[PDB]
Amino acid sequence: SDEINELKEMVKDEHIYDKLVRSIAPAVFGHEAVKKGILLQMLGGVHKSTVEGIKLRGDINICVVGDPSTSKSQFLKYVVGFAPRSVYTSGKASSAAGLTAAVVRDYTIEAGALMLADNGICCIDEFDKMDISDQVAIHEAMEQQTISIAKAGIHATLNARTSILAAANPVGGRYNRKLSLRGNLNMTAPIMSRFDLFFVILDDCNEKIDTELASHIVDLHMKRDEAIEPPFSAEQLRRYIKYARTFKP
Amino acid sequence: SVLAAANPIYGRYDDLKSPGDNIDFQTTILSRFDMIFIVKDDHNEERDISIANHVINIHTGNANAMQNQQEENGSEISIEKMKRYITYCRLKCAPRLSPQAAEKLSSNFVTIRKQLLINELESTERPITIRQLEAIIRITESLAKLELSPIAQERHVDEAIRLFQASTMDAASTSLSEIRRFEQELKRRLPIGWSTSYQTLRREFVDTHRFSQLALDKALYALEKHET
């Protein structure tokens, strides 16, 4: 009622897109790509129809790649901070399930990890550390869309419809510009082809940008000035988004 | 006396490839073996139609089977007889070669050695052993033991030379040089070789859109031989 006026005020303006983009991750400095990359996960496709038949996707996926110190993790922490229904794991230590259910034995089911965040954004650091075992499970999540669970007891099927935001370090933690990205990320082909798209970042030295980084970081570690502020407040952007979710584009 | 039928790899390109180099990494097998016949079943137009027509029918009225059976009657030696014959000739008589046939074969083998050396001046990739000569011999005695004669003749060998000549004709028949590098890797990449291994060339040639198993080995075997 009182707020809907604000919502209207948001949809009216022609810049509020740009406002969104610039206001997403204050902590992070620039890059402008992964801003959009992060937000466009929160707002997903129709994920419905086309029957008869098999259902379209729907949702979205992203895997951020880059030389460390690029603060690729700050995004992550910002997402687990900002949006509800978001799980954060650092796996390598997943360890296994983890991302799936035990099941507890009875036939009561553990949450857990991945699936307890549903219709949402799950954020995993370092795909490259979890080796073979679980990655396959994730593939089973992003292919069949369902999580099938049978252990020494009651057989089961549990749905998880989720977006997966990963941060994956390169083979040598570096480029390798000359190498094919296909060869660089070092995760298996089928899970690779389901992530669209990667939004790779590499940081290279530019004295303007360098000065801006040192300035900005020292700024951050200063209680003053913390006056740096986004055009949208972190609280309102949620009710805005949730409003924008009720549309069937 | 071993009679072996190998299965070659990848098909016709293995003919485009060096004639040897087929079995494992080593031609030595082919060196031990006397008569090597990579073959073709080019149906004289009447063959493929033979097999086809045979498939079409294959029912009634056993006419074809009959035809096979009279082919068996007329089909030269009943083959139940052929056996007894082979036993016969095998135990009874042990043949021996004639001197002019011998010197003939000397000329044979020295022409082989010389000419085919000259052929390999260019390092043409393919072979000649005195074992092969010994083979030619054993063919002459074999066929001499057909005629059952205690002695060999010249013409008698004159067949053998050309038969084995057909065998020699059988001995004769991502770009390679590019993958043949590995050289860039062997150098300014790894003087040791270690932590390089086939696994490395695999990581080096895994996401480069590039290397086949035979490709990887070929270029490797190539450079191994080439001396790079």
Curated annotation (Swiss-Prot), chain A:
Family, according to the entry, reads as follows: Belongs to the MCM family.
Residues that bind ATP, according to the entry?
A: G66, D67, P68, S69, T70, S71, K72, S73
Q: Indicate where this protein resides in the cell.
A: Nucleus
From the Swiss-Prot or TrEMBL record, give the protein name: DNA replication licensing factor MCM6
Q: Which positions does the motif Arginine finger occupy?
A: 193-196
Which consequence is recorded for altering K72A? Answer: Loss of MCM2-7 complex helicase activity
More details: Present with 13400 molecules/cell in log phase SD medium.
Coiled-coil stretches, from where to where?
Answer: none
| Subunit (UniProt) | Component of the MCM2-7 complex. The complex forms a toroidal hexameric ring with the proposed subunit order MCM2-MCM6-MCM4-MCM7-MCM3-MCM5; loaded onto DNA, forms a head-head double hexamer. Interacts with MCM10.
General function of this protein: Acts as a component of the MCM2-7 complex (MCM complex) which is the putative replicative helicase essential for 'once per cell cycle' DNA replication initiation and elongation in eukaryotic cells. The active ATPase sites in the MCM2-7 ring are formed through the interaction surfaces of two neighboring subunits such that a critical structure of a conserved arginine finger motif is provided in trans relative to the ATP-binding site of the Walker A box of the adjacent subunit. The six ATPase active sites, however, are likely to contribute differentially to the complex helicase activity.
Q: Which residues form the MCM domain?
A: 16-218
From Swiss-Prot, chain B:
What Gene Ontology molecular-function terms does this entry list? ATP binding; ATP hydrolysis activity; chromatin binding; DNA replication origin binding; helicase activity
State the compartments where it is located.
Answer: Nucleus
Give the top-rank taxon of the lineage listed in the UniProt record for this protein. Answer: Eukaryota
Residues spanning the membrane: none
Q: Major location, coarse class?
A: nucleus
GO CC, any one term: nucleus
Which UniProt keywords are given for this protein, alphabetically ordered? ATP-binding, Cell cycle, DNA replication, DNA-binding, Helicase, Hydrolase, Nucleotide-binding, Nucleus
Motif placement: Arginine finger: 31-34
Its Gene Ontology biological processes? Answer: DNA replication initiation; double-strand break repair via break-induced replication; heterochromatin formation; nuclear DNA replication; pre-replicative complex assembly involved in nuclear cell cycle DNA replication; premeiotic DNA replication; regulation of DNA-templated DNA replication initiation; subtelomeric heterochromatin formation
The family assignment reads: Belongs to the MCM family.
User: Quaternary structure?
Assistant: Component of the MCM2-7 complex. The complex forms a toroidal hexameric ring with the proposed subunit order MCM2-MCM6-MCM4-MCM7-MCM3-MCM5; loaded onto DNA, forms a head-head double hexamer. Interacts with CSM1.
What's the stated role of this polypeptide?
Answer: Acts as a component of the MCM2-7 complex (MCM complex) which is the putative replicative helicase essential for 'once per cell cycle' DNA replication initiation and elongation in eukaryotic cells. The active ATPase sites in the MCM2-7 ring are formed through the interaction surfaces of two neighboring subunits such that a critical structure of a conserved arginine finger motif is provided in trans relative to the ATP-binding site of the Walker A box of the adjacent subunit.
Note from the entry: Present with 10300 molecules/cell in log phase SD medium.
What is the name of the protein in this document?
Answer: Minichromosome maintenance protein 5
- Native organism taxonomy: Eukaryota, Fungi, Dikarya, Ascomycota, Saccharomycotina
Instruction: Name the gene behind this protein.
Output: MCM5
